[PDB]
Design a protein around this nucleic acid. Structure first.
Lengths: 48, 154, 128, 41, 138, 96, 98, 180
RNA sequence: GUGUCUAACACAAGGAAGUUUAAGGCAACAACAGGUCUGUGAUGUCCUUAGAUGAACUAGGCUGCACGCGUGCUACACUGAUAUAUAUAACGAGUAAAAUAUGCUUGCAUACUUUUCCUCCGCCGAAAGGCGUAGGUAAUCUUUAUCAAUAUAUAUCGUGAUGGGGAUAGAUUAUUGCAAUUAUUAAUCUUGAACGAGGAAUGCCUAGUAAGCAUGAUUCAUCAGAUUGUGCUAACUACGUC
């Protein structure tokens, strides 16, 4: 199979395996549509 | 302007008595008189930033740049090559895109720094990293600072 | 008097010696600046005060700049694959080299050649 | 505009119009008398 | 020996250290002279002239400035100089004289005594500015 | 020119080449290109003056012109010219 | 001794308790140094498909670091810290002079 | 003691229309060594009316395309322009500048009818008129911005037809006269 | 002062602040057949399910170009560009494969050591960049008591599509990647277009805002003319009305 240790197909959402829209900030691999569901249980609070 | 009626007591002994630009141009003229440094070779074809796209226009520039380096060395004794690149940094015109910052030419900076080390006015500290002035380098700068301070006074 | 004819077909005098030279070829200025320094013209002075020797020096430099101390990277035009050396163009040689390049792309039938033949951008129009 | 001659109060635009020279030549004329936006007052 | 007071405009903060001395005034590594723009030098010489330099020659001043740009820093310096003059006159000289001195400064302006209140409004989505928007269309 | 170019070593050929070409050869030929080249070499040597080499199952556009390539028809279709050295195919684009 | 948590109340509570504990066994402590707050900041578009208005919100997961340190032998400080803890506070001990 | 640029005392001016005198910064607490003070003028209507006239002039001058926010050069240009006026005529440059502001202020304005204009509005329009004339003269021209400003001020003080400020002021008044 | 003299407003003074101190977060009742089943192991029905509309691999394509409309960037210059010089900031962010070694004929087979993200520093490189290595799980090292650019100063143009401007194009040597060609991205020299301040129209904005100038983060194997933050330079003009 083709090399996928780089580029878009190397990465996907942990929760749902999405092929786009993945937040890789702080190296947790979750797509934003998943992230808004879980951000409170992960620990995040909103102020702005 | 050039002579000022200040409301306070000036130091009359060091690099902050004299105007930075006047010091740099005057000291550069002294360095050229002395015959302290040469280009060498590759440094003839430079431009300080990449986007300048002309030779330095004021003709006495190399000694001025050297002199400007010496003033910074007196200020900060922990300097290395990356510090000089950032210090002399400017904006770079990206044409049909906005400007962004770009580091100055590193080989000429390295050449001046190394050549001054060889001529004994600066010294690499490998522990507590960075080139500083030697006491001989500092004394020469202080002597020049006193001479200029005397010249502004009379 | 205040004017002089410049070799390679320009007539100047109020213009600075670099500014006259650049207004021929080397208009990116850096090529002109190295030529001015090599020639030994006064770069802050005007072109109508130039001597015949100064003009001759500039033409000599323009024709052959490799003998002078100008770097290989600094010179325009480079390898071009073929054995007969291709370093440095300017003027009708620049025009000729462009025409040769255009002919070579056309002869290949390269994408860029075809686009040049069409009379359109290398990158594509991008919906204008 | 047509100002260009090498050879035939202080304010460089005024010097350049009156004697029909460039402002670069006018600054040279100011320096010759003396013997950026810098003052000549 | 030593008393300390300060100035604050925008990010910039200038702490001024007023010691018993002989009339030296410093700005970090620099003499007071080396501000650079003539306009903003004149602004920090201004309170010194309003008191008079013959009332300042028994004290040495060093100031340390961090934060902001040049225009913001000079107003922070002018505040730090103002408060510096005042703190020396309260701590060494005389409190009644300090109130009298403070009155002269205050009538001239309140700006050296009480710093600028202006602080940045944060960017919001849908425009470059704080309140400003990218162009609407139909 | 050409006779010397055919004679010279791979290190010399990369040194003569422009840096993009030089980097490609330094990075690696891989399977594909080498496999095709061997087939093109064999076909060119064993043929008389006349009909030319065929396409490859992988339809390659990713290999540039080298001095022994000349006169071969590449994989959709174009024939490599003598003076085409280092300049890629340009092939399989589309027009109005 | 360095105290880390993402729980604001629990780190604050434990700090007062360990200080109180320290004076019980009469240990020489430097007053609690609250270290610069580290925030995990996420700027998120509100629309899940990105349709309609360009609405963004900024989420923060704010982690608390604090230090209290002691001039003592290792054994007393380690035993006192080990008994006094609350589960969401993650503690590390730092060794000191005799 | 206190003098603008260390050379102009600026403690005495002539009456004008009397309305102008309240606004202008001739008083010793409003006169200054150098203009830059940059206050807060948004509290209420008459807060901005207390501004130093030289600060108001440099702020008015500085806005124009490429120039926006270059305040120190605008101070240097006004300082140079006042020096040009001082050389050209023996009257104090500030006094001449006050005369230009008096002359530049129109006394009527209009809607579809004609109306009077307030003293604050007259001052704001006059300052604006002087800077617009200097700016118009400056852009795409050989003359210096300092030279343009100084010439516009003296000519407006004179009441010359060469002045952009007089020409605009006359035009605003003429439109008011036309409307009524 | 004005006000049922209540609720409260207006002015001045005091004061760090007087409008609720300034900015966000926050988000009723009830809708819209608004958008999204191209995010979901949320999901009905209907289609499809072995020369598959699944998974996967090789190219090509999403960007082509008589032409029409959004939104930004760069410009149209002497209140400026050009070359040198002075000044300075805040938010951040920083763990299964490579290298080395052995046996065989670039290739094949095996072992083993660490490379892995930020880069100080030291040499070499016009420039990009290269090589050698250090310190960092971080208020500590990168690096931020100093990392920026407009500002501003002295010089050079002396106002003429001009040395403004960088479209468009040619030769390079580099960097990432299996692959760079339909300029990937990078620099060097050369090439030197339009644009002379913008019709009918229409956008945003009341105080550190508006505007100008930068810069961190996001996507990232590779890249900002984007978005989102952050600082600095610091205006005008009402201070109201339908």
């Amino acid at each position: 199979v083709h090399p996928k240790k780089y580029g878009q197909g190397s990465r996907q959402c942990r929760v749902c395996s999405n092929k786009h829209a993945i937040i890789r900030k702080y190296n947790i691999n979750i797509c934003r549509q998943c992230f808004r569901e879980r951000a409170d249980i992960i620990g995040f609070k909103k102020y702005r | 302007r050039l002579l000022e009626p200040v409301p306070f007591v000036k130091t009359n002994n060091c690099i902050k008595d004299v105007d930075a630009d006047l010091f740099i141009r005057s000291y550069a003229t002294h360095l050229k008189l002395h015959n302290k440094i040469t280009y060498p070779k590759w440094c003839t074809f430079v431009k300080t930033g990449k986007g300048r796209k002309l030779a330095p226009l004021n003709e006495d520039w190399y000694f001025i740049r050297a002199s400007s380096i010496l003033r910074r060395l007196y200020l900060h004794p922990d300097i290395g090559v990356g510090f000089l690149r950032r210090q002399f940094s400017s904006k770079q015109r990206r044409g049909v895109a906005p400007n962004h910052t770009s580091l100055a030419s590193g080989k000429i900076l390295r050449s001046i720094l190394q050549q001054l080390e060889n001529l004994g006015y600066v010294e690499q500290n490998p522990k507590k990293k960075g080139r500083r002035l030697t006491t001989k380098g500092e004394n020469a700068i202080n002597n020049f600072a006193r001479y200029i301070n005397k010249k502004v006074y009379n | 008097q205040h004017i002089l004819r410049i070799l390679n077909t320009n007539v100047d005098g109020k213009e600075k010696v670099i500014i006259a030279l650049t207004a021929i070829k080397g208009i990116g200025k850096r090529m002109a600046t190295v030529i001015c320094k090599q020639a030994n013209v006064d770069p802050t002075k005007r072109a109508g005060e130039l001597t015949t020797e100064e003009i001759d020096n500039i033409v000599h430099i323009m024709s052959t700049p490799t003998q002078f101390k100008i770097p290989d990277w600094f010179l325009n035009r480079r390898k071009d694959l073929k054995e007969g050396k291709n370093i440095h163009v300017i003027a009708n040689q620049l025009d000729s080299y462009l025409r040769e390049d255009l002919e070579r792309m056309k002869k290949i039938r390269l994408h860029r050649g075809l686009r040049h033949h069409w009379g359109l951008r290398v990158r594509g129009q991008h919906t204008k | 505009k047509l100002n260009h001659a090498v050879f035939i109060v202080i304010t460089p635009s005024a010097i350049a119009e009156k004697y029909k020279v460039n402002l670069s030549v006018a600054r040279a004329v100011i320096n010759h008398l003396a013997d950026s936006q810098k003052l000549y007052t | 020996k030593r008393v300390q007071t300060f100035g604050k405009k925008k990010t910039a903060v200038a702490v001024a250290t007023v010691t018993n001395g002989k009339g030296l005034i410093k700005l970090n590594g620099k003499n007071l002279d080396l501000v650079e723009p003539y306009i903003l030098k004149t602004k920090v010489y201004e309170p010194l002239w309003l008191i008079g330099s013959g009332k300042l020659k028994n004290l040495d001043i060093r100031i340390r400035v961090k934060g902001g740009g040049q225009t913001s820093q000079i107003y922070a310096i002018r505040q730090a100089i103002g408060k510096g003059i005042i703190s020396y006159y309260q701590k060494y000289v005389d409190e009644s004289t300090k109130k009298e001195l403070k009155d002269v400064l205050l009538r001239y302006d309140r700006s050296l005594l009480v710093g600028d209140t202006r602080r940045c409004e944060p960017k919001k989505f849908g425009g470059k500015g704080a309140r400003a928007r990218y162009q609407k269309s139909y | 020119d050409l006779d010397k170019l055919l004679d010279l070593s791979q290190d010399e050929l990369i040194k003569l080449f422009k840096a993009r070409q030089r980097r490609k050869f330094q990075r690696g030929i891989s399977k594909k290109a080498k496999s095709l080249l061997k087939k093109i070499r064999k076909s060119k040597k064993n043929c008389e003056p006349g009909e030319k080499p065929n396409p490859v199952p992988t339809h390659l556009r990713n290999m540039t012109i080298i001095p022994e390539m000349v006169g071969s028809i590449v994989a959709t279709n174009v024939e490599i010219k003598p003076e085409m050295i280092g300049y890629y195919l340009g092939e399989f684009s589309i027009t109005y | 001794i360095a105290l880390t948590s993402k729980n604001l109340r629990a780190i604050e509570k434990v700090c007062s308790d360990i200080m109180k504990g320290a004076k019980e066994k009469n240990l020489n402590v430097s007053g609690p140094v609250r270290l610069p707050v580290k925030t995990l900041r996420i700027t998120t578009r509100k629309s899940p498909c990105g349709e309609g208005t360009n609405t963004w919100d900024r989420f923060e997961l704010r982690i608390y670091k604090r230090l209290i340190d002691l001039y003592s032998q290792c054994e007393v400080v380690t035993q006192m810290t080990s008994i006094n803890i609350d589960p969401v506070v993650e503690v590390e001990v730092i060794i000191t002079d005799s | 003691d206190i003098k603008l640029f260390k050379k102009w005392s600026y403690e005495e001016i002539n009456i004008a229309d009397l309305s102008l005198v309240d606004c202008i910064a001739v008083s010793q607490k409003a006169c200054v060594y150098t203009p830059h003070t940059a206050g807060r003028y948004q509290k209420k209507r008459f807060r901005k009316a207390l501004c130093p006239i030289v600060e108001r002039l440099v702020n008015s001058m500085m806005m124009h395309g490429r120039n926006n926010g270059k305040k120190l050069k605008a101070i240097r240009i006004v300082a140079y322009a006042f020096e040009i006026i001082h050389l050209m005529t023996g009257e104090n440059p500030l006094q001449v500048f006050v005369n230009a502001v008096q002359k530049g202020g129109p006394r009527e304005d209009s809607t579809r009818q004609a109306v009077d204009v307030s003293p604050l509005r007259r001052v704001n329009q006059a300052i604006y008129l002087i800077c617009t004339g200097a700016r118009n003269a400056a852009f795409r021209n050989i003359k210096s911005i300092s030279e343009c400003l100084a010439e516009e001020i003296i000519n407006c003080a004179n009441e010359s037809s060469s002045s952009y400020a007089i020409k605009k002021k006359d035009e605003i008044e003429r439109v008011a006269k036309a409307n009524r």
